[PDB]
Amino acid sequence: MAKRIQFSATGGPEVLEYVDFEPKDPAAGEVQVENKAIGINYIDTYVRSGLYPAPLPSGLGSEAAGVVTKVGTGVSHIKVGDRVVYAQSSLGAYSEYHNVPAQKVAVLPEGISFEQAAASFLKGLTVQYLFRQTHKIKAGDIFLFHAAAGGVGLIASQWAKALGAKLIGTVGSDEKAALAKEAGAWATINYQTEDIAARVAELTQGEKVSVVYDSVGKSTWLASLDSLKRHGLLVSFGNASGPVKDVDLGILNQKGSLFVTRPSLNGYITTQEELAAASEELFSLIASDAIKVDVKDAQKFPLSQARRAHETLESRATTGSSLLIP
């Protein structure tokens, strides 16, 4: 018997239940991970609130890192006792134990701890596909990245710097602005003080940017469109401020024959080769200290306190990644 967070009905943070359950032995494709550190992602809040349909009662989270305890029939590439991380498990990473298909699990280097992995893996895999697959950031490129002080943002800042690119990062405070700069962001915009698109025009002497990465959605839709040059790409990969509905394609024409895409992690990592390749890049850059992955002690919540943790994430008081410790 072990512990997991679940919810019996959708709602706010108050619906999170901390219960016992019997972990089942892994099936033929799978490995059982004794989770040691668990990732906290905005999608966890969306699932919990019913924005994403899930059978009830449901687990929560798809990102965690820990020690492999048992291994299923077919699994060669991963062995008992391996330290691993995953970002795409079935809902249920919020648990002391969770089975995951071996294909969707990456073995950690010795340098990367459980806590770093669960902070950086899903968010780091997200950055890699955004920057290397959805649109290949070249050295010298100016681009806009919303929420640069967030978990995804700080990895994006540091990755951009490693690529020799110039990330303009939107942030909600002067403190978050300095942090994003420290993390390698070329320039900074305060999305409460300043007009985003205006400031982008200023910083590019009118030339604008060929790509925008926008995890905010509704609030910043117009702002992001106005920030793009002719033929530019708007990459909406998040709905922090609510979704982007009621769009007339024609607006893509008005704003200069723009492209727009709504990618997701599952949309870009579908096989173990794809996960291997992307993970190799992520770990490579964490290992060489190009991407440093910290987690404030205030944002390490016990698994028991999952409620408390979710409340924190929704108030936007956090910077960087958060973690649940089983």
Residues 259-318 that bind its own copies (CB under 8 A): 259-264, 267-268, 270
User: How far from the centroid of its chain's Cα atoms is residue 217's Cα?
Assistant: 15
User: Interface with its own copies includes 50 (CB under 8 A)?
Assistant: no
User: Which is nearer to its own copies, 24 or 231 (by Cβ)?
Assistant: 231
User: Which is nearer to its own copies, 251 or 317 (by Cβ)?
Assistant: 251
User: Which is nearer to its own copies, 236 or 299 (by Cβ)?
Assistant: 236
User: Which contiguous run of DSSP H or E holds residue 228?
Assistant: strand 228-236
Residues 174-233 that bind its own copies (CB under 8 A): 217, 230-231, 233
Secondary structure of residue 19 in the 3-state scheme: strand
Secondary structure of residue 51 in the 3-state scheme: coil
Rounded Cα distance, 188 and 33, in Å: 40
CB of 158 within 8 A of CB of 120? no
What's the min distance (Å) between Cβ of 267 and its own copies?
A: 3
Q: Which of 81, 46, 64 is nearest to 4 (CA)?
A: 64
Rounded Cα distance, 281 and 127, in Å: 11
| Angle, vertex CA 184, rays to CA 180 and CA 185, nearest 5 | 55
User: Which is nearer to its own copies, 237 or 301 (by Cβ)?
Assistant: 237
CB of 85 within 8 A of CB of 121? yes
What's the min distance (Å) between Cβ of 38 and its own copies?
A: 25
Residues 120-159 that bind its own copies (CB under 8 A): 134
Cβ atoms within 10 Å, residue 182: 12
User: Which is nearer to its own copies, 142 or 258 (by Cβ)?
Assistant: 258
User: Which is nearer to its own copies, 97 or 213 (by Cβ)?
Assistant: 213
CB of 155 within 8 A of CB of 127? yes
User: Interface with its own copies includes 236 (CB under 8 A)?
Assistant: yes
Total residues at interface with its own copies (CB under 8 A): 29
Residues 244-263 that bind its own copies (CB under 8 A): 244-253, 256-263
User: Which is nearer to its own copies, 65 or 156 (by Cβ)?
Assistant: 156
User: Interface with its own copies includes 52 (CB under 8 A)?
Assistant: no
Rounded Cα distance, 225 and 217, in Å: 11
The region of 73-81, 103-111, 239-247, 292-300 touching its own copies under the rule CB under 8 A is: 239-247
User: Which contiguous run of DSSP H or E holds residue 46?
Assistant: helix 42-49
User: Which is nearer to its own copies, 95 or 134 (by Cβ)?
Assistant: 134
What's the min distance (Å) between Cβ of 274 and its own copies?
A: 11
Long-range contacts, 242-245 (Cβ 8 Å, 24+): 242/217, 242/218, 243/217, 243/218, 244/217, 244/218
Residues at the site binding its own copies, with contacts judged by CB under 8 A: 134, 217, 230-231, 233, 236, 243-253, 256-264, 267-268, 270
